[PDB]
A and B are shown apart, each in its own frame.
Chain A
Amino acid sequence: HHALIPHGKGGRSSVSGIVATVFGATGFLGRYVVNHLGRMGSQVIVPYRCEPYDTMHLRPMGDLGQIIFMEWNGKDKDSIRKVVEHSNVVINLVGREWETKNFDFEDVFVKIPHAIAQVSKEAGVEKLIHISHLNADIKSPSRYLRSKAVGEKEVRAAFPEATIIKPSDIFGREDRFLNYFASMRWFGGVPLISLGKETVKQPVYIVDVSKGIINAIKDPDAKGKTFAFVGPNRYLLFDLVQYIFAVAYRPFLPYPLPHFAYRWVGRLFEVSPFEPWTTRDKVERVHMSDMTLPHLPGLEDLGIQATPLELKAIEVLRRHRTYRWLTSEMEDVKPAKTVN
């Protein structure tokens, strides 16, 4: 019913034919998803639960009228119905790495997505894109990934023809993955469980993830398929953190820490009323090695070649450099050892 013929040359003023409701667009992934949608000419409906000031950065992303901001509440289904009523596509990117008093992991990764999928199915939205960590599993130590797996099951139940994208740690300028490791310099040495030798991670660039989502929206075959988004190279946590500190040109002092001590430290930082620096779930997820899932299709299926971490690391980590190393070129630091 809500079908628009695409018109134009794909610019800001063109009509892509894509009407989308990007839940959780006021976040690291939402910014790039909205920018990619707007550049094509698509109409983007942004539900925002925060102050309008925080959504201001997304205002220039689209041409006049393309970006519509409507306040929504995750608990209230009627707001979801209002936001998703006229959209031919819905993207759910609502996720908090730290639990909060009002909303726990269950609500953010299970209840919210299920309500979104059900209301979208009722409204008639053609396509739905849902994001769940690649490491998501019902038996995982981290509550975050456990709720992620339960939410994936529920979303598939409510919306049978729903594309579920399972991305790894997404490194970017606003990332909480590279910045998280770089910020550990302030605390002196870098605490690593087992020194990071036992953990292997496959980070993915944020722009690649957003382009994959957009291509999945464009791709007809993507319906009812689960894609795994992973970077070109797999790294040991020790090597990856060492490369982060090298590109940041900050001294690296890795010191092994027992898992229980790290969990206690995570509990200490959870106390913060504001956004926690780290959580026990954060420690568990960092330590957990990235799963390899050959069965699922990846970025190559959607037509995007994953950008290596080496190319884009300087963008994220230059700010952490001091004045001496601010102007150092990207090539000065050799690529880290890859466990492939």
Chain B
Amino acid sequence: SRGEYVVAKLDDLVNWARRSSLWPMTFGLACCAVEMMHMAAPRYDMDRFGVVFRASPRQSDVMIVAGTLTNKMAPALRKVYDQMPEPRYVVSMGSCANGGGYYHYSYSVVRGCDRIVPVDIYVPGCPPTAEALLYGILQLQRKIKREKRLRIWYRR
């Protein structure tokens, strides 16, 4: 159907815009943030891919939970995620963020950021290498490329 073709092409345009311009928020909890900065560094510059760190949650599109999320910090993380406008995607970097890692059995650690906020891509490692984080970001971009919001709207 011509309507299906138009919807598919418009969805392609929107997904391309969203994946090409991915603005992570300046959120780094722990050692994994340093590998994130190295990703921002010249060798693996993420600005080439359109990933620009923006501080304000309302002006950001992706939250990368780099570092251990303590029970004290979890409400702030949830608040920052909520204040972030949608579409919003969450990437969990490092074993500490993914499932608690080295401090899984600590009283003051949330055993994974999945408990607090929905996570789209999990980047393994402790710390994950900057190339690994870039791979995760590109995987998130492909995931956005696979999204079918307008097609589902037309079919619904």
A residues whose Cβ falls under 8 Å from a Cβ of B: 49-53, 56-57, 59-60, 64, 100, 102-103, 274
Which of A56, A100, A102 touches B120 (beta carbons < 8 Å)? Answer: A56
Determine whether the beta carbon of A51 is less than 8 Å from that of B147: yes
In the bound complex, CA of A64 to CA of B114 (Å) = 9
Determine whether the beta carbon of A60 is less than 8 Å from that of B115: yes
The 10 closest A-B pairs by CB, nearest first: A56-B118, A59-B118, A51-B149, A51-B152, A60-B118, A50-B152, A60-B114, A51-B148, A51-B147, A60-B115
A contact residues around B119 at 8 Å (CB): 59
Determine whether the beta carbon of A102 is less than 8 Å from that of B156: yes
B residues whose Cβ falls under 8 Å from a Cβ of A: 87, 114-120, 147-149, 152-153, 155-156
B63 to chain A, nearest CB (A): 13
10 A–B contacts from the bound complex (CB under 8 Å): A51-B147, A51-B152, A53-B147, A53-B149, A57-B118, A60-B115, A64-B114, A102-B155, A102-B156, A103-B156
Which residue of chain B is the closest to A274 with respect to CB atoms? B153
In the bound complex, CA of A50 to CA of B119 (Å) = 18
In the bound complex, CA of A47 to CA of B148 (Å) = 17
Interface of B is mostly: loop
In the bound complex, CA of A274 to CA of B152 (Å) = 12
B contact residues around A49 at 8 Å (CB): 152, 156
A146 to chain B, nearest CB (A): 22
A contact residues around B115 at 8 Å (CB): 60
Task: Given the known inter-chain contacts A51-B147, A53-B87, A53-B149, please indicate yes or no for A59 contacting B156, CB distance below 8 A.
Answer: no
B contact residues around A53 at 8 Å (CB): 87, 147, 149
In the bound complex, CA of A171 to CA of B67 (Å) = 39
In the bound complex, CA of A60 to CA of B117 (Å) = 7
In the bound complex, CA of A137 to CA of B89 (Å) = 44
Determine whether the beta carbon of B156 is less than 8 Å from that of A100: yes
Which of A51, A52, A59, A103 neighbours the largest number of chain B CB atoms within 10 Å of its CB? A51
In the bound complex, CA of A274 to CA of B153 (Å) = 8
Q: A59-B114, A60-B115 are in contact. List 11 more A-B contacts (CB 8 A).
A: A51-B147, A51-B152, A52-B147, A53-B87, A56-B118, A60-B116, A64-B114, A100-B156, A102-B156, A103-B156, A274-B153
